[PDB]
Paper text:
The hemichannel is composed of 6 connexin subunits arranged around a central funnel. Each subunit consists of 4 transmembrane helices (TM1–4), an N-terminal helix, which lines the funnel entrance, a cytoplasmic loop, two extracellular loops, and a short C-terminal tail. Here, we use cryoelectron microscopy (cryo-EM) to determine the structure of human [name] gap junctions under increasing levels of [name].
In maps derived from data collected from protein vitrified at under 20 mmHg [name] conditions, the general trend was the same, but the N termini were never as well defined as those corresponding to higher [name], indicative of more mobility of the N termini. Our inference from all the maps we examined, irrespective of particle number, lowpass resolution filter, masking, etc., was that the density associated with the N terminus was more distinct in the data obtained at high [name] relative to that with low [name]. On the other hand, in the map associated with the top class from the 20 mmHg [name] data, which contained 58% of the particles, the density associated with the N terminus was less defined and indicative of adopting a position nearer to the cytoplasmic side. In our structures, there does appear to be some degree of flexibility in this area, and the variability analysis from cryoSPARC for the structure at low [name] indicates a slight breathing at this point.
Residue numbers in the entry:
A (entry chain E), B (entry chain D), C (entry chain C), D (entry chain B), E (entry chain A), F (entry chain F): 4 to 102, 129 to 217
């Protein structure tokens, strides 16, 4: 709808890599998250199965091993990497309404925050889920589960495929931002 | 759709902080509530589990500990902090149709109500839920539950993460409004 | 979408209170009904629990105590209070296509029907549900329930909060319409 | 969206009653069907309860007493009463593209089909469901149900309220069409 | 939305029957499929009931008697009868961009494919489902069902009503296309 | 909505086959995936039935035989075959903003990536699912299933019909791209 119209304006104001490659990969990630990945995680808790009769053990074991869902993490990441661009668009429009360094300092800082947000969320993915591969079986001993209980994840393989996809694209977006930084560094 | 078009008009009529930072944080909260948080709370009652055989104990215990859902509280808060801006937009448009102090008094009062509504809802969150952290286990003794019954919350950790997020952003919006008040106070 | 565009036209043709305050409160009620209240009532019958083994007792007890849902009553009320405005918009447009008293008599009658419809639905709410507070427990003795059966309502407290909200706003809309009537009465 | 834009064109081409009253009542019926009535019938078969252990008896008893749902009947009726208007709109547009009696004969026939379709569907409602009141209990003896089985309808009272509403409005639309016919009859 | 805008362009480029009657019946079928029929088939497998204890017998019996759902067959048919029109629209637009027989041969062939696709899908409906009437009871003896198992269809009568409706309209569309062929045949 | 407007621009910039046939088949695949196929796979795991009492055996057997769903594979394929066209559209627009071989090399490479992506996904379909026919019965011996367990697929025949459809259209799109390559090869 209006999203592509809005992205058209920010498309008209960027650099070689920024106009084309960064914008395409950003839309690439949104399409994957929306049309494909969001329904892989639909039954994440409904189809989580634990071999026990203890009431409440399923709730605490799912919450222990999935403190925040993968799709919610990716939704937050896309929002954080798109706000610096949104700020520049309004900042330029505000400057136009009133009417080198002013735009240069904002634009350079704008791509600096995207690298930080991109790397921070990638780091969170690794430490929180201990690698990018999801297991079929999780062993849970949190109260009130008696001793250790076996619980089984829903669609672990398909979730691994989409996890590798999102991580790979995010890593590419980091490299593109770094090269854009170098092109504005050699300019001096 | 038309929401960003409407927000464009109120964007053209504000001050330095108001045009950019307050508008972005407002859109920031809406995006989190809509695309991410609204489906964390989807199974709040369906996956609420109580260790009992008493019919009706689950209904009364959920109602006792969640008198109003977090997402409904945030939906009300966003509506209340956006109506003073909506009133100004129509008030100015009405003034334009007919055609310093008149706009100054409205604008100053407009940011005064936003601070009150923002703080009031933040206060309600603290007293009603006793802090911003959701527990795995709630103990319930309301009739008809016999003695005290253990009940287990769905996704307590993910709900805590989004609760901290919404509270933190709301606190920032309060500070931005206060600074805008100071800039219009030193003007005299 | 187009709803705000349509409301813009009727905004350009009204009086001081009518242009701003009545229009805002009308949009205020629609937002509450759509984005917040409509999913409080989602599981009204699914989570209605009765302490019995009699087949069909749940169906007849829910139907006895909720002959028409609150959200359906509010949906009907908003439609009825918006059609007199819709009639005027087409009546004026028809008059414009062909091309004081003619518009005055229609406009005065237009706000007269809104008061009647607003008060009629408020009266129905009171008599049908016996006050604006929803109870946790309902006692039901309709056939085929044996003797008297205890049944438990879903989310009674949250439904009470939204009921008080909609009633309070509707009462304010009545007062605004009455004042508009007085302003057109003192004119003579 | 575009529906009101399309209805605006046919609004500009009609008569006194046709431009305003018939168009409003048509939109009145669509709003009731869409925003309110369509979710009263959502659990029509899911909450249909029969007092039996015979497999398949629930399927045949629901199908016997509800050969076609009320909402599907109303959806068909609205489509049938809106196509004669749609034909005229394209027929006039086609005539405009190429460029008294020609339009008069089409317009007069156009309101003649609406009366027939309106009355035909109203007749079907009466004979198929034996009045406009829905009962709590239906007795079913179709195979494979043993002897006669008691089955219980979901939300019979709320469905009766909306049935009376749709029938009453349809009867009014018939009267408006007849008066329009008389105005074009006295013209001669 | 944009669908009626697109259909407006192809409306401006057709013949007497093609501009009006064929276009209306095509929209007539889409409306029935979308707003009414698509939710009759919603619980086709969920409410399919078999009188057995054999695991997997329900899956194989439903798959045996409904190799492809009616609504999916109609969705494919509408796509196939609308692509020849879509090809002509782009072919003409391409010809316009570059800038009797060329358009005549395409248009004549365009209505020739619609007749073939319309008749082919109607033939598939008859052979696959053995007439246009759906039965309440199906007897199934595919492995792993022991001996012959009784299974019961959901909403057989309502599905029969919509099946007769779609078949009747499709047969009318065939006759309209044939008459258009004759009008272009007598021209010579 | 805006998708057809965007496709209109890329329609105006292509060759004979590319403007018409490749664009139509691309829209042909999207329509099938969206309006028809996406709800065949809706209950892929909900209606997956295994003849066992072992907890967790259903989760591991479904994950073993469907590592990634067919609809998710097709969603990825459509995204990958549409990005080279999207890159060209922005690359040309960027060139227009600044202002033979430059466009020729991009366009020729653009159709070269589409052939590679089209063939790669078709190869994945064959090796992963061992042909294009889905079976009613799958035998599963992954841990924790004891010995070998019989499991039954939901709607195997309808999924086979749509699988053959998508594969056949993709093979045609490969042939069209190859012919376009030959036309640009004989040019030299």
């Amino acid at each position: 709808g209006t999203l592509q119209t809005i992205l058209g304006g920010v498309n008209k104001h960027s650099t070689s890599i920024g106009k084309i490659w960064l914008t395409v990969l950003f839309i690439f990630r949104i399409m994957i998250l929306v049309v494909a990945a969001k329904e892989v995680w639909g039954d994440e808790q409904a189809d989580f199965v634990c071999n026990t009769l203890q009431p409440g053990c399923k709730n605490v074991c799912y919450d222990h091993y999935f403190p925040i869902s993968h799709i919610r993490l990716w939704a937050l990441q896309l929002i954080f990497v798109s706000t610096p661009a949104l700020l520049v668009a309004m900042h330029v429009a505000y400057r136009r309404h009133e009417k080198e360094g002013s735009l240069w300092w904002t634009y350079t800082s704008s791509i600096f925050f995207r690298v930080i947000f991109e790397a921070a969320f990638m780091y969170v993915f690794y430490v929180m889920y201990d690698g990018f591969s999801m297991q079929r079986l999780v062993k849970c001993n949190a109260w009130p589960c008696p001793n250790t209980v076996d619980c089984f994840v829903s669609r672990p393989t398909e979730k691994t495929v989409f996890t590798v996809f999102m991580i790979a694209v995010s890593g590419i977006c980091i490299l593109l931002n770094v090269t854009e930084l170098c092109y504005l560094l050699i300019r001096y």
